[PDB]
Amino acid sequence: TFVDPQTVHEFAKELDATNISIDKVVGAGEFGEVCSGRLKLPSKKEISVAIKTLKVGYTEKQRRDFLGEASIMGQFDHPNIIRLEGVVTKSKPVMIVTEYMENGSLDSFLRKHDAQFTVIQLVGMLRGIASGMKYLSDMGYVHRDLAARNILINSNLVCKVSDFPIRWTSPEAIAYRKFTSASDVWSYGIVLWEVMSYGERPYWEMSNQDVIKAVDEGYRLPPPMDCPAALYQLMLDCWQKDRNNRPKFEQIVSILDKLIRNPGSLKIITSASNLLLDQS
C-alpha cells in the first residue's frame, strides 16, 4: 500500500554527493536544473543517472514540493516505474537522483520515429506501461497525470511511468474530481492512442470545452492509421462512459500478453482528423 506523505528519508536513500558526478546539463526544470551523470553505488558499481537540483534561494514550499516527488517515487520498486536512486539533502543544492532513460519522454521519442517501429515493438512498450500501472493501482496510488509525455523510454525501449490535463482525464474526474484507478485506465486508453499514433496530441488542439462536451456526448478519438482492431477495441474499452465497465490494469496486461503470444491477431486492422461517435 501507498501512503500519502516529513519523511523523505522513510522512502529515500540519502546519497553521499562524493558518489555523484554530472556529465551533461539538460536544461531547466520546475524547481531548478535538470542534468545527467553517474552514481557510484556502495558496491562500487557505477551507473548512469538522471539528476535534478533545487534552485538556489528556494522557498520552503518549493523544497517540500520538490522532495515530495521522492517521498512518492521511493515507495515503488517495479521495473516499469522510474527508480529512485536517492536524494541529497545534507548539502546544497538539494538533489533527486533517478533512473537514467536514454530515449527520454515517449511522446517526443515516437514523434521522431513516425511509422518506424513494428506493431509488436509498440505493443511491448504498451505492456510495460500497463504493468507499471497495475503495480501503482495495486498500491492504491492514483496517478492522475498518466500521459505519453510522463512515460520515459530507455535504450532498450522499456517504458516506465514517471511524474510523481483535460485531454487525458476521464469524464467523471473532469465533472466532479472522481479520481480512481479506473480514471487512470481512461488515461491509459489515451496513452494507447498516443503510442499507436506515434505521439500525436490527443484531440489535437480542440477547444478544451469541446473536448469535454464531445467526450460526454459519446465521441472518441478515431482509430490511428493501420491500428489493429484489437488495440482500437482496447482503447474503446478503456474509454467506457461507465467507469465500472472499464478493464482493470491486470486485464489490460493480460490482453496485451495474449496479443504478444498470438501476433497474428494484430493483423486484423480496424476497418478503418475528426472524432467518432461510439455507442458501445
Side-chain angles (χ1 to χ4, degrees), residues 46-239:
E46 291 172 16
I47 59 167
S48 294
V49 288
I51 302 157
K52 290 199 292 188
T53 56
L54 179 59
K55 65 174 281 189
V56 176
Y58 60 87
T59 62
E60 293 286 284
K61 176 167 165 50
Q62 281 171 329
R63 183 176 185 280
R64 281 195 300 272
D65 293 346
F66 179 71
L67 291 175
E69 173 181 7
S71 301
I72 296 170
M73 182 186 287
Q75 299 188 46
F76 307 130
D77 174 28
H78 186 279
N80 296 288
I81 305 295
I82 288 295
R83 177 174 180 84
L84 178 67
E85 291 295 335
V87 297
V88 180
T89 63
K90 298 180 177 180
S91 56
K92 302 182 188 186
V94 178
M95 289 181 169
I96 295 170
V97 183
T98 59
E99 192 165 4
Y100 176 72
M101 302 293 283
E102 181 181 322
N103 291 136
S105 295
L106 183 58
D107 68 318
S108 59
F109 178 74
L110 292 176
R111 282 193 293 274
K112 293 268 184 175
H113 298 294
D114 187 27
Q116 296 172 16
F117 296 118
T118 67
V119 176
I120 199 62
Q121 285 177 302
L122 298 175
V123 170
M125 294 175 191
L126 290 158
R127 193 274 186 203
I129 299 162
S131 185
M133 292 306 304
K134 199 275 183 181
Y135 190 56
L136 292 180
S137 56
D138 272 7
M139 294 284 282
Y141 183 77
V142 179
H143 190 288
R144 308 195 178 191
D145 308 297
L146 176 60
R149 66 186 185 284
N150 292 330
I151 302 300
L152 298 177
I153 180 167
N154 75 10
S155 69
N156 295 137
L157 308 184
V158 180
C159 291
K160 308 194 184 206
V161 182
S162 185
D163 185 43
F164 294 99
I166 289 291
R167 288 162 155 70
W168 290 266
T169 302
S170 72
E172 72 278 359
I174 292 167
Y176 70 115
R177 306 194 277 253
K178 185 54 60 186
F179 285 98
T180 64
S181 288
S183 56
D184 280 346
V185 166
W186 179 286
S187 302
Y188 182 86
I190 302 296
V191 172
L192 177 47
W193 187 92
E194 293 183 278
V195 169
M196 300 313 299
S197 301
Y198 285 87
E200 205 153 20
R201 177 175 174 79
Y203 311 91
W204 317 281
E205 293 178 81
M206 286 180 64
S207 197
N208 283 18
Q209 294 307 318
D210 286 320
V211 175
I212 293 166
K213 194 94 180 62
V215 170
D216 183 53
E217 290 180 15
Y219 286 88
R220 300 292 183 261
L221 291 163
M225 186 178 302
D226 300 321
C227 190
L231 293 174
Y232 191 57
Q233 184 67 56
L234 179 57
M235 293 174 209
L236 298 180
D237 292 348
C238 291
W239 303 328

